[PDB]
Coordinates of C-alpha atoms and ligand atoms in Angstrom, one line a residue:
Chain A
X1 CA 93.1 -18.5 97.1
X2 CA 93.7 -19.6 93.3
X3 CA 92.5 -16.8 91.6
X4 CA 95.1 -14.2 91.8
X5 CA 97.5 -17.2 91.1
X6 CA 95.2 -19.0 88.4
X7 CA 94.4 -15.4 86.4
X8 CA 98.3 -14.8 86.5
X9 CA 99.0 -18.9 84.8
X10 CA 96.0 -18.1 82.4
X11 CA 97.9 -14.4 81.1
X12 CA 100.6 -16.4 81.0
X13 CA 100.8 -17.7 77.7
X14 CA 102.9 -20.4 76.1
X15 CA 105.7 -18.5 75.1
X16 CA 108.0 -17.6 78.0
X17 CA 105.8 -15.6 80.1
X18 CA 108.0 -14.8 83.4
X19 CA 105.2 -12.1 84.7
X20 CA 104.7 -10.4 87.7
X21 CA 101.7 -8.2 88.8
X22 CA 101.7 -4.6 89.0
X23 CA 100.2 -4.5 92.4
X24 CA 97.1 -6.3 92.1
X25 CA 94.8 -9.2 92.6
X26 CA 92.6 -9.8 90.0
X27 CA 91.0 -6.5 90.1
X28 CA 91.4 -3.6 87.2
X29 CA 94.2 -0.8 87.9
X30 CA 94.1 2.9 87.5
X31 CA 96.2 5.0 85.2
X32 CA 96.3 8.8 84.2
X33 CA 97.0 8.8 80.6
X34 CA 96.2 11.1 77.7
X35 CA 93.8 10.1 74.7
X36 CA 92.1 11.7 71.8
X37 CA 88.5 11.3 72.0
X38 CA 85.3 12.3 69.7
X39 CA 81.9 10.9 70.8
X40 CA 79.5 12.9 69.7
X41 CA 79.2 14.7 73.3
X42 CA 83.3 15.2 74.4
X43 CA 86.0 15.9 72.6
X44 CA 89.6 17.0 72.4
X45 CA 93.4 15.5 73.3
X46 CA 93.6 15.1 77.1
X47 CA 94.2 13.3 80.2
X48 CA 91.6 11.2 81.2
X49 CA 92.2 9.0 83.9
X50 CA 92.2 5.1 82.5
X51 CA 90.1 2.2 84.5
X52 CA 89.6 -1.3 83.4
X53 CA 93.0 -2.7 82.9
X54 CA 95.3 -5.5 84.5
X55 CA 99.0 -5.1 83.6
X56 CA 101.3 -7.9 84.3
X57 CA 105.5 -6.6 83.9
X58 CA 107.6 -9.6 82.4
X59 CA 110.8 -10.9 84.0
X60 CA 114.2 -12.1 82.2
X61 CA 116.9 -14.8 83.1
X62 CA 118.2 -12.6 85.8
X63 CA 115.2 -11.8 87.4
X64 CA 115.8 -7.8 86.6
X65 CA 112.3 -6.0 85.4
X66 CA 112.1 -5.5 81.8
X67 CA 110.0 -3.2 79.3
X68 CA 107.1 -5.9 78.6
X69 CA 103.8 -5.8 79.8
X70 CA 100.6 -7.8 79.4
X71 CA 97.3 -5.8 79.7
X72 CA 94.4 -7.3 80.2
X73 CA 91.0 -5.6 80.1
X74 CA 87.0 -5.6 80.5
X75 CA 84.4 -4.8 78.3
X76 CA 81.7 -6.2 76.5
X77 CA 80.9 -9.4 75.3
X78 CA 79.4 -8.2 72.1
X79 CA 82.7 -6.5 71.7
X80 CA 84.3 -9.6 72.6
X81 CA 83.2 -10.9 69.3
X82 CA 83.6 -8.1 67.7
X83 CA 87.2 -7.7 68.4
X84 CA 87.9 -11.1 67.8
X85 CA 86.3 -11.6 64.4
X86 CA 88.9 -8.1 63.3
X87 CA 91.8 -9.1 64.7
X88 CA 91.3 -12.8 62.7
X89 CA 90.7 -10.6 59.4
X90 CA 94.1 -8.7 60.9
X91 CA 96.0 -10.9 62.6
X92 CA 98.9 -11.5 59.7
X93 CA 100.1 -8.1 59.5
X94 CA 103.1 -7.8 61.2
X95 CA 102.3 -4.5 62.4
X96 CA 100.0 -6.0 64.5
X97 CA 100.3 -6.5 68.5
X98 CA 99.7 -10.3 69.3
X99 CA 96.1 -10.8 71.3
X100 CA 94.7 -13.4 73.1
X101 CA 90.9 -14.2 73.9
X102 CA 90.0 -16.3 76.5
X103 CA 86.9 -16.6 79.2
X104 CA 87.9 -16.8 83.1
X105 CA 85.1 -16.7 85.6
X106 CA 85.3 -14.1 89.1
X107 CA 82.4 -15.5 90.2
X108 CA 79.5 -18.0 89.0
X109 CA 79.4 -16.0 86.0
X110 CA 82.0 -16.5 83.2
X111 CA 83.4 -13.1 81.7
X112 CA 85.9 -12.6 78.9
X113 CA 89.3 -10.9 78.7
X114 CA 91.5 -10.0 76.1
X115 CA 95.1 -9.6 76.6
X116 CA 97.8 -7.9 74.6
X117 CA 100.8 -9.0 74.8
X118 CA 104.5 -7.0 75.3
X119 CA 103.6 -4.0 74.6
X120 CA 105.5 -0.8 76.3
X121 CA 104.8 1.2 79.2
X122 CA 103.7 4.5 77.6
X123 CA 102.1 5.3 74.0
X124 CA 102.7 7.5 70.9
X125 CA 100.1 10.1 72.2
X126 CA 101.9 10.3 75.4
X127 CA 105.1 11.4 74.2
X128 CA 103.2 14.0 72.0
X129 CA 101.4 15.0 75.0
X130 CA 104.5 15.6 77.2
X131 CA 106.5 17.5 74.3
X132 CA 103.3 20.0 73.6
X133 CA 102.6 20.7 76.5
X134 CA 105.9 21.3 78.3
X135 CA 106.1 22.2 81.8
X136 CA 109.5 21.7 83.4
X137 CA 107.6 21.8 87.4
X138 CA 106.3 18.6 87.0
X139 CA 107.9 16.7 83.7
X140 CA 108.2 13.1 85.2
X141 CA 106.8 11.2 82.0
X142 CA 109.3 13.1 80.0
X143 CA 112.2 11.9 82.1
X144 CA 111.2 8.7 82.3
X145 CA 110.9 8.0 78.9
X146 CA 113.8 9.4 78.0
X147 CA 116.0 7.6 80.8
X148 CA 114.3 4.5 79.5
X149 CA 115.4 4.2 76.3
X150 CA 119.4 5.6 76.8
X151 CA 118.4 9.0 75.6
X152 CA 120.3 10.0 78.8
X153 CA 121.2 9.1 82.1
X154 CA 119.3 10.2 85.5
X155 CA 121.9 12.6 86.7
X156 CA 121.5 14.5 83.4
X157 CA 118.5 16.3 85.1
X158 CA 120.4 17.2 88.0
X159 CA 121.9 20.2 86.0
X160 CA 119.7 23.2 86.0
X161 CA 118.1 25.0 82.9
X162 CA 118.6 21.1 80.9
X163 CA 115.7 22.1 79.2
X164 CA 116.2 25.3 78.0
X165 CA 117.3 26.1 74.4
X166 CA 118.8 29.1 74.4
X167 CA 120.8 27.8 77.3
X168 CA 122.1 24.1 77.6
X169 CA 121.8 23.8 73.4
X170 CA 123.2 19.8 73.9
X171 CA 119.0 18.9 74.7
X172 CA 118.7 19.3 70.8
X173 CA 121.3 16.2 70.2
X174 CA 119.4 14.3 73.7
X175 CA 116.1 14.8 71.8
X176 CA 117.8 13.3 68.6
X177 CA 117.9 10.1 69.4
X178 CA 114.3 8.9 69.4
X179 CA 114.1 9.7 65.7
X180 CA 115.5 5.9 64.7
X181 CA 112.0 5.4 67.0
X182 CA 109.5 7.9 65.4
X183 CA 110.4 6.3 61.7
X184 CA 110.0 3.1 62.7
X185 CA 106.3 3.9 63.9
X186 CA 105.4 5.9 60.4
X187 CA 106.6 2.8 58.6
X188 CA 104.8 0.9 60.5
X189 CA 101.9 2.8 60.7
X190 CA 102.1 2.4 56.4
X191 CA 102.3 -0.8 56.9
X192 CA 98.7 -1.2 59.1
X193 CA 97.2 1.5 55.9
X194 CA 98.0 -1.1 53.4
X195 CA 96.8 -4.4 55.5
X196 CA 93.6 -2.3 56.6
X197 CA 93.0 -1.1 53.0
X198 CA 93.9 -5.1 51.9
X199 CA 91.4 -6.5 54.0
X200 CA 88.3 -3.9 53.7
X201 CA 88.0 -2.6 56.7
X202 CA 87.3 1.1 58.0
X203 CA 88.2 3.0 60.8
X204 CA 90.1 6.2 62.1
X205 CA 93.5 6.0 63.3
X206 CA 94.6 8.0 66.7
X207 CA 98.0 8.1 68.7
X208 CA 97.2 6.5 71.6
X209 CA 96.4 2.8 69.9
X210 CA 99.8 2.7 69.0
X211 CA 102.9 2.2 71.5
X212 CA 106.3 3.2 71.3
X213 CA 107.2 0.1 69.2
X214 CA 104.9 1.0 66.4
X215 CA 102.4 -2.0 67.5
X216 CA 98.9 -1.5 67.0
X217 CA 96.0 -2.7 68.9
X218 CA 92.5 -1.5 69.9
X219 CA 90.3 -2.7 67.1
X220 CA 86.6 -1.6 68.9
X221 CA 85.7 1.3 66.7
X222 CA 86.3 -0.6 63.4
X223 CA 83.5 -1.9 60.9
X224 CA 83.8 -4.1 57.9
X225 CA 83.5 -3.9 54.5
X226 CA 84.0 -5.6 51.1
X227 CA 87.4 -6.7 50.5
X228 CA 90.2 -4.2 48.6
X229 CA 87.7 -1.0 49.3
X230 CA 89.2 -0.1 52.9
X231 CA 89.6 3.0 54.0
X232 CA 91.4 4.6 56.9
X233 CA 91.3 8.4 58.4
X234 CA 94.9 9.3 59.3
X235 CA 94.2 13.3 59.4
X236 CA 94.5 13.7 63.2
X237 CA 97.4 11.6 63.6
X238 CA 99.5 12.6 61.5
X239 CA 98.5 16.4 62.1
X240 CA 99.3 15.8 65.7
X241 CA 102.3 14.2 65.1
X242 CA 103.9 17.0 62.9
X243 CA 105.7 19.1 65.3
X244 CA 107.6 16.3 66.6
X245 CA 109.1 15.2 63.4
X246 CA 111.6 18.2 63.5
X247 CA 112.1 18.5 66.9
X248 CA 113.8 14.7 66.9
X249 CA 115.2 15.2 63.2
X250 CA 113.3 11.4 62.2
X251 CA 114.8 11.4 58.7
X252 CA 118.2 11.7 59.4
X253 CA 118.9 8.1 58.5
X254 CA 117.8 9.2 54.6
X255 CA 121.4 11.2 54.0
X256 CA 123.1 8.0 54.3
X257 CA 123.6 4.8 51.7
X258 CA 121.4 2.7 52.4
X259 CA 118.8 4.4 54.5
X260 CA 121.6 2.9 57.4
X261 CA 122.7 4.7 59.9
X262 CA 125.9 2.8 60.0
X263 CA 127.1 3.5 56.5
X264 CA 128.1 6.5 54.9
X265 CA 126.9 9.5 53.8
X266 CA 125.0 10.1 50.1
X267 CA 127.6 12.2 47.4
X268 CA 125.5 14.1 45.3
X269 CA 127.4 16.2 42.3
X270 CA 127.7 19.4 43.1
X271 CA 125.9 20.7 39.8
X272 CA 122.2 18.9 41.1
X273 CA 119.3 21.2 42.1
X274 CA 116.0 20.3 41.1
X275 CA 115.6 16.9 43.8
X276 CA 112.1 17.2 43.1
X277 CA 111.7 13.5 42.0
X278 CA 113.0 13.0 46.1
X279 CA 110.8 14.9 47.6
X280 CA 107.7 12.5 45.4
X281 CA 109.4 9.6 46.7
X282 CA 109.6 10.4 50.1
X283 CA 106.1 11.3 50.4
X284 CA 105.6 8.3 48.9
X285 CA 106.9 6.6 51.7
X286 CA 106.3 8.4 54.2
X287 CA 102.6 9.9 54.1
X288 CA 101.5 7.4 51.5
X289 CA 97.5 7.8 53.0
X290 CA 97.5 11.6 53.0
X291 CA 94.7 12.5 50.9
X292 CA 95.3 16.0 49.3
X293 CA 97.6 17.0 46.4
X294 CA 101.1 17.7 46.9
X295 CA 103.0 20.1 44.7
X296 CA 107.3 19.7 45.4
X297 CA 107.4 23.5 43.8
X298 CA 104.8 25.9 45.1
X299 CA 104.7 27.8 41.7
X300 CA 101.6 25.0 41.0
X301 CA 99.5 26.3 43.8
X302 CA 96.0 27.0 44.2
X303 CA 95.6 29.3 46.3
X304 CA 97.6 30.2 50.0
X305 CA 96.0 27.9 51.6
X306 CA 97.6 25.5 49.4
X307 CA 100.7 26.9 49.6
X308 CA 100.9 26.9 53.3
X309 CA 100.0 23.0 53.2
X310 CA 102.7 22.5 51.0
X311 CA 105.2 24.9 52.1
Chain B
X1 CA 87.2 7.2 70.9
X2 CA 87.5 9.1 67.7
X3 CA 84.1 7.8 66.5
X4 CA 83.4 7.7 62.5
X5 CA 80.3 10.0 62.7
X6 CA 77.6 9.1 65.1
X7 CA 74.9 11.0 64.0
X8 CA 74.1 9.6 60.0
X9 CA 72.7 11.5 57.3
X10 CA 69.6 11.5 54.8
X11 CA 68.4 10.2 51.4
X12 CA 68.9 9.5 48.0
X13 CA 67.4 10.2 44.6
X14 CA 67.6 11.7 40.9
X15 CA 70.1 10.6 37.5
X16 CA 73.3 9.2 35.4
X17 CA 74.9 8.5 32.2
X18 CA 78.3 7.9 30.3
X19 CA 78.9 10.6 27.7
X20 CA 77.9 14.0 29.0
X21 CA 74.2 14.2 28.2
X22 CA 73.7 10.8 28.2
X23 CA 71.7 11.7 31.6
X24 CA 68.4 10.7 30.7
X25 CA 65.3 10.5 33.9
X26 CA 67.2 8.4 36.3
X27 CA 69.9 5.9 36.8
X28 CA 71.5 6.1 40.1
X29 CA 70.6 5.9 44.1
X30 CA 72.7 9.0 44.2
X31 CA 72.8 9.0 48.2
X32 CA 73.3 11.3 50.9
X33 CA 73.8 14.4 52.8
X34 CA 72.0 18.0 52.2
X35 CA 74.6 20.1 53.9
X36 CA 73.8 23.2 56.1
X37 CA 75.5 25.4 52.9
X38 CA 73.0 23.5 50.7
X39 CA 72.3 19.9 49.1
X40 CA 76.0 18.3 48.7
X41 CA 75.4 14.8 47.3
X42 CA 78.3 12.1 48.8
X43 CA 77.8 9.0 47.1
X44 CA 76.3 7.2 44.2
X45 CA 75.0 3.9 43.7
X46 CA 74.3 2.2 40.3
X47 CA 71.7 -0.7 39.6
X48 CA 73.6 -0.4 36.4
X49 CA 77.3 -1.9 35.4
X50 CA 79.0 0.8 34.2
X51 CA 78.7 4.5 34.4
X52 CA 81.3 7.6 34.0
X53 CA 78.9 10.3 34.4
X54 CA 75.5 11.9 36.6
X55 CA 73.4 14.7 36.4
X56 CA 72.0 16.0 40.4
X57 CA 69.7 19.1 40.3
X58 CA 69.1 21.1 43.0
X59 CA 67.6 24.4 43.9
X60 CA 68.0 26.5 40.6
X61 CA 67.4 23.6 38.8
X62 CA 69.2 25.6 35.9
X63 CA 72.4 24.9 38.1
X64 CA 72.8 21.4 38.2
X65 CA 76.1 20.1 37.5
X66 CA 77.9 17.1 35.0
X67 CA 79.8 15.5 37.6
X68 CA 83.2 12.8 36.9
X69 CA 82.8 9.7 38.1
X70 CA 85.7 7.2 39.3
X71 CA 86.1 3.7 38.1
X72 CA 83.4 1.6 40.1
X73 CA 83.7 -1.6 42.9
X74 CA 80.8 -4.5 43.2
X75 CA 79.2 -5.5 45.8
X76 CA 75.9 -7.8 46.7
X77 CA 73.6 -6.6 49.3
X78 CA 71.6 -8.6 51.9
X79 CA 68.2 -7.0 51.3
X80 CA 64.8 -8.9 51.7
X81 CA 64.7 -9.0 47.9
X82 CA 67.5 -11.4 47.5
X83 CA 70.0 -11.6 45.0
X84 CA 70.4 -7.1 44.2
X85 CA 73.6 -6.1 42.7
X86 CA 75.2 -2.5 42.2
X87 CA 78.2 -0.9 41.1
X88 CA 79.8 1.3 43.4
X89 CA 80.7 4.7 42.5
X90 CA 82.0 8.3 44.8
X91 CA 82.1 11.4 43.3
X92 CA 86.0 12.1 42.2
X93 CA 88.1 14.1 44.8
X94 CA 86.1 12.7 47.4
X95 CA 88.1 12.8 51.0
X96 CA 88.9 10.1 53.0
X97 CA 86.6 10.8 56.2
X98 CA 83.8 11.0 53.6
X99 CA 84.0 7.4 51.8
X100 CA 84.3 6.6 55.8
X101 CA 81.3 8.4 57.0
X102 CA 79.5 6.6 53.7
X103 CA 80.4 3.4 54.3
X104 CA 80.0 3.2 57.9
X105 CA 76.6 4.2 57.3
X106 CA 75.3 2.0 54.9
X107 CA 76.9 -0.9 56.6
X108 CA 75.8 -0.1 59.9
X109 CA 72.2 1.1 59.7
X110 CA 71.2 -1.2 56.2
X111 CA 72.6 -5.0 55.4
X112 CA 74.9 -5.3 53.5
X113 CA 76.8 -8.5 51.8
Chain C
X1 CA 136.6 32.1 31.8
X2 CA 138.1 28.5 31.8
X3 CA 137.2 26.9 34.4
X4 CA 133.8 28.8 34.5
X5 CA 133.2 27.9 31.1
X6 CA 134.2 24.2 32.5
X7 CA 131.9 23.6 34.9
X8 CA 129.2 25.4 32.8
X9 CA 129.1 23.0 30.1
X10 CA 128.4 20.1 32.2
X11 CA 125.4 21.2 33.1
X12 CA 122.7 20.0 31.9
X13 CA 120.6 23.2 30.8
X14 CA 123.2 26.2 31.4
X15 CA 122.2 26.4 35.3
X16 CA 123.6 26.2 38.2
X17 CA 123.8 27.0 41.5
X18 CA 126.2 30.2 42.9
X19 CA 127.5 28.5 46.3
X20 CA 129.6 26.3 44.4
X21 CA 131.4 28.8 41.8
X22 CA 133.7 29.9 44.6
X23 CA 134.3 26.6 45.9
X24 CA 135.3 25.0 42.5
X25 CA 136.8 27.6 40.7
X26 CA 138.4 30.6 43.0
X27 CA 142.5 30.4 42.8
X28 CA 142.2 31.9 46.4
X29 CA 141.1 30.9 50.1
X30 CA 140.9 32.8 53.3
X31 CA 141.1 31.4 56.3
X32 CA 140.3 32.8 59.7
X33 CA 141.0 31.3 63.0
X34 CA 139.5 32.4 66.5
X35 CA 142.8 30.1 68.5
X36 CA 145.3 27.7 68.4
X37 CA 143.6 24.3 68.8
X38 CA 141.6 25.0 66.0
X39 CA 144.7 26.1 64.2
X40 CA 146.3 23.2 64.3
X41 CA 143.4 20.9 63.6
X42 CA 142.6 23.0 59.9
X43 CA 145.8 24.3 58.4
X44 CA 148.7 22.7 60.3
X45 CA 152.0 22.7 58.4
X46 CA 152.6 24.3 54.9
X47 CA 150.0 22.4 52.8
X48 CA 146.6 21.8 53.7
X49 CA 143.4 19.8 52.3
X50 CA 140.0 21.4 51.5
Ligands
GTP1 N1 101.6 1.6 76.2 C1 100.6 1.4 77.2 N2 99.5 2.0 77.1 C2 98.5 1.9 78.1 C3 98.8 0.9 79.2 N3 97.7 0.9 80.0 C4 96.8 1.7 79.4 N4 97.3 2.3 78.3 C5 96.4 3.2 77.5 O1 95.1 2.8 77.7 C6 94.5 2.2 76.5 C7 94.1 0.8 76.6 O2 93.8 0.3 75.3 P1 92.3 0.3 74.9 O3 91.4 0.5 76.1 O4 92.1 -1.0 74.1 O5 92.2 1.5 73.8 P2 91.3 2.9 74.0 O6 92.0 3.9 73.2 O7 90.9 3.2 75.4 O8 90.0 2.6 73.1 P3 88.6 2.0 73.7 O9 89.0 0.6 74.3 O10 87.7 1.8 72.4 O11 88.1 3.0 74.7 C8 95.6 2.4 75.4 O12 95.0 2.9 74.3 C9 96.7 3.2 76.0 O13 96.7 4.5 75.5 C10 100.1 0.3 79.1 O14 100.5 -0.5 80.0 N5 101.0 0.6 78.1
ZN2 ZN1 100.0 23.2 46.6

């Protein structure tokens, strides 16, 4: 009675919202995701098993599921406030998943939610997760986001030895095609550096606040400060992230024109071989937040530790 | 979480100037951090409005070092005085997580404006 | 020592790079095929582009 079919009106917000529930009422559902975590007593990059959440899946025209979801989640109402007075310092970036804060009462009492709206079924972190720590018994996260984004089809996996390397070498050109996806996010993620930096706020920047869109969220571990002297930690992330920026060849889309991937290729003369102005540019660009000295030719080094970094 | 360093750090005293010895008694709130290694000094605040350069001894005393400053920011502080203004400064080369760890800090455990 | 001395002057300091001295200025190419379809998709007929 109501409830479940009041809490489902009140998610939905004024936009379109065609939502269906994920097999709930109005209680919180259960997910085993994988997060990076430092808390002064655990720490590491695992998979914890997630609790307070409601997710809501959004409908088209046709009535056929789509990739949307609305999740809605408990926690404090000191970090109601919180939260709230962030995202209003952050809400004009448009790197920024779209929230909504509202109060909705289970019982005489009157607790507050706050929803984030169309985000994607699975995270950054998660795809990191499944590609470092590879085990083709049970690789069903893998699969799925690959079938969901027309990596593949579903009968792909029905050959044997699809993952192997050495064997099967057509999974390198499958992987390739979630690069376009991968240099969005970094851009993105840029893009959320220079609004955080803008507005003076601090905070440390992990995988699993971002999904596969390049949205961000999760503001709860934030603090504030004057404006212009922000500062976020990006050393984890991008550390994390590393491996999977050759293994998807992200900056293919830089040997063409116009950065497009519908225009042809880049004709340098065959007499240029320095490109060291490039390489500053792209880093630039790219890992514009990276604090530490880069030298394009290692003859500048320090020591081998430096060499390795930029090697 | 990833948590920007729950357990703090301690205290903050000694010198500055702008042209090498210009180091005098004391002209800073030099603050934070004595490090397992020894004392490493994180961040300087400056009653002052401009400085370029600090003096911090420690253990030898005869090795104390004439550190570089970075071109300051302003801010004004909520303390039960009233109207307090410094000019902030980090030692140069500073990493990110360190500014971080700083900031957090001061803003969390003392008011700040 | 004409061509060589050619594409040397362009350059902008005297350098440059030995992968592309046989490819603009050799007056020979070799050319081997492993089969038939690739034959006729590199060097069909009596004059070919590379
Ligand atoms: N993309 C996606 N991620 C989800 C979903 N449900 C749960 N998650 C994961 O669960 C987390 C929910 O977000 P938050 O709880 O705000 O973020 P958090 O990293 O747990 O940080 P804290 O709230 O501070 O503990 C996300 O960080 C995701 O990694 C979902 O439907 N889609
Ligand atoms: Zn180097």
């Amino acid at each position: 009675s109501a409830d479940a079919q009041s809490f489902l009106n009140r998610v939905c917000g004024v936009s379109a919202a065609r939502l269906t529930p994920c097999g709930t009422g109005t209680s919180t559902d259960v997910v085993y995701r994988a997060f990076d975590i430092y808390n002064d007593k655990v720490a590491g990059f695992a998979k914890f098993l997630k609790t307070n959440c409601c997710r809501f899946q959004e409908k088209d025209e046709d009535d056929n599921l789509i990739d949307s979801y609305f999740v809605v989640k408990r926690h404090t109402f000191s970090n109601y406030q919180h939260e709230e007075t962030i995202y209003n310092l952050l809400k004009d970036c448009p790197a920024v998943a779209k929230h909504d804060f509202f109060k909705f009462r289970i019982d005489g009492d009157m607790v507050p939610h706050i929803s984030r709206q169309r985000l994607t079924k699975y995270t950054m972190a998660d795809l990191v997760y499944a590609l470092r720590h590879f085990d083709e018994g049970n690789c069903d996260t893998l699969k799925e986001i690959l079938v969901t984004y027309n990596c593949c089809d579903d009968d792909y996996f029905n050959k044997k030895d699809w993952y192997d390397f050495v064997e099967n070498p057509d999974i390198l050109r499958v992987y390739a095609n979630l690069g376009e996806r991968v240099r969005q996010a970094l851009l993105k993620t840029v893009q959320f550096c220079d609004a955080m930096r803008n507005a003076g706020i601090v905070g440390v920047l992990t995988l699993d606040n971002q999904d596969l869109n390049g949205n961000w969220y999760d503001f709860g571990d934030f603090i504030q400060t004057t404006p212009g002297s922000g500062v976020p930690v990006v050393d984890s992330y991008y550390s994390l992230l590393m491996p999977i920026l050759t293994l998807t060849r992200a900056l293919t889309a830089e040997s063409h024109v116009d950065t497009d991937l519908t225009k042809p290729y880049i004709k340098w003369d065959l007499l240029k071989y320095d490109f060291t102005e490039e390489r500053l540019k792209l880093f630039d660009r790219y890992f514009k937040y990276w604090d530490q000295t880069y030298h394009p030719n290692c003859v500048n080094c320090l020591d081998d530790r430096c060499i390795l970094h930029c090697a | 979480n990833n948590e920007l360093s729950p357990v703090a750090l301690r205290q903050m005293s000694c010198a500055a100037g702008t042209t090498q010895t210009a180091c005098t008694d004391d002209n800073a709130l030099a603050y934070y951090n004595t490090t397992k290694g020894g004392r490493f000094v994180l961040a300087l605040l400056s009653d002052l409005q401009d400085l370029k350069w600090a003096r911090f001894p420690k253990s030898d005393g005869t090795g104390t070092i004439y550190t570089e400053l970075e071109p300051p920011c302003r801010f004004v502080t909520d303390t039960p005085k009233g109207p307090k203004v410094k000019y902030l400064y980090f030692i140069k080369g500073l990493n990110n997580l360190n500014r971080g760890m700083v900031l957090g800090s001061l803003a969390a455990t003392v008011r700040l404006q | 020592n004409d061509a060589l001395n050619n594409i040397i002057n362009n350059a902008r300091d005297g350098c440059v790079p030995l992968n592309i001295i046989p490819l603009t200025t050799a007056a020979k190419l070799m050319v081997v095929i492993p089969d038939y379809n690739t034959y006729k998709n590199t060097c069909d007929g009596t004059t070919f582009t590379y």
